[PDB]
């Protein structure tokens, strides 16, 4: 993290308009649809075979809410982006063995979902800051492959 004072603000002033409950699951839904190998990990979940049945999965919307949760814990605790996630990193790496590049895919689709919802106010320099937050959050979860 660095987040120049003028990046920090564009990021902070987006999130407060974010309907976490219904964005977290637009993202986790899009993840299983665009990158289907991720479905392997969610077979505890139900019917994931056609894109409608995912975006309308009460589970997929439930779990996603936990996920915008930990982006919230990151988006404003950026000082140790590493330390807020230690346990989750322990959960994703040496428990579920999710390869680190999925961590980038998820943050990337999150950005597509941030763009999809906010349209023109997701201006390029306001994107450029989110690619920094996301890349950081993704370097943090992956800290236990070392």
């Amino acid at each position: 993290v660095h987040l120049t004072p003028e990046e920090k603000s564009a990021v902070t002033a987006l999130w407060g308009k974010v309907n976490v409950d219904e964005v977290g699951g637009e993202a986790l839904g899009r993840l299983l649809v665009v990158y289907p190998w991720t479905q392997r990990f969610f077979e505890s979940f139900g019917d994931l075979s056609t894109p409608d049945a995912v975006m309308g999965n009460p589970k997929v919307k439930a779990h996603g809410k936990k996920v915008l949760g930990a982006f919230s814990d990151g988006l404003a605790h950026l000082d140790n982006l590493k330390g807020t996630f230690a346990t989750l990193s322990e959960l994703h790496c040496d428990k579920l063995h999710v390869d680190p590049e999925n961590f980038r895919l998820l943050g990337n689709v999150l950005v597509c979902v941030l763009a999809h919802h906010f349209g023109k106010e997701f201006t390029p320099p306001v994107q450029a800051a989110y690619q920094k937050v996301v890349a950081g959050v993704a370097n943090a979860l992956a800290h236990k492959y070392h």
Binding site: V33, V111, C112, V113, H116, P125, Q127
Partner: protein
């Protein structure tokens, strides 16, 4: 691969992108240059600035080549050939950059087309671009 119906979501999503394709291809350069600064290496002769006529002029080119992939999509290899010799022989673009531009491009379809941009179409557009990049890197392989 690029199924009968992915071929349909792309011919449609680009269908309503129409008139704007050139503004969009240039918005997505601006996004790539901003977010992933490691790509600026290749355009030292561009003003990588917001108003820049060069990036705005190049948006037209990237958008022209995307169109000539949307139409001829059942045969990308032949159509995109000289761009798959320019980027791969002449320029030597690291193929990881193609992933990034594909992503900014999607963040641009998203930010301008919310109703089209259904999850299935996000998948199709991604599958489309993943094939454009595969074509663009095929001298490499």
């Amino acid at each position: 691969v690029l199924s009968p119906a992915d071929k349909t979501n792309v011919k449609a999503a680009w269908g309503k992108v129409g008139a704007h394709a050139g503004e969009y291809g240039a918005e997505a350069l601006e996004r790539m240059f901003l977010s992933f600064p490691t790509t600026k290496t290749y355009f030292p002769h561009f003003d990588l600035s917001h108003g820049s006529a060069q990036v705005k002029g190049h948006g037209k080119k990237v958008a022209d080549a995307l169109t000539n992939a949307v139409a001829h999509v059942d045969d990308m290899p032949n159509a995109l050939s000289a761009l798959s010799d320019l980027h791969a022989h002449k320029l030597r673009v690291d193929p990881v950059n193609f992933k990034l531009l594909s992503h900014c491009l999607l963040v641009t379809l998203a930010a301008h087309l919310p109703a089209e941009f259904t999850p299935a179409v996000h998948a199709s557009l991604d599958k489309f671009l993943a094939s454009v990049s595969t074509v663009l890197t095929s001298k490499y392989r």
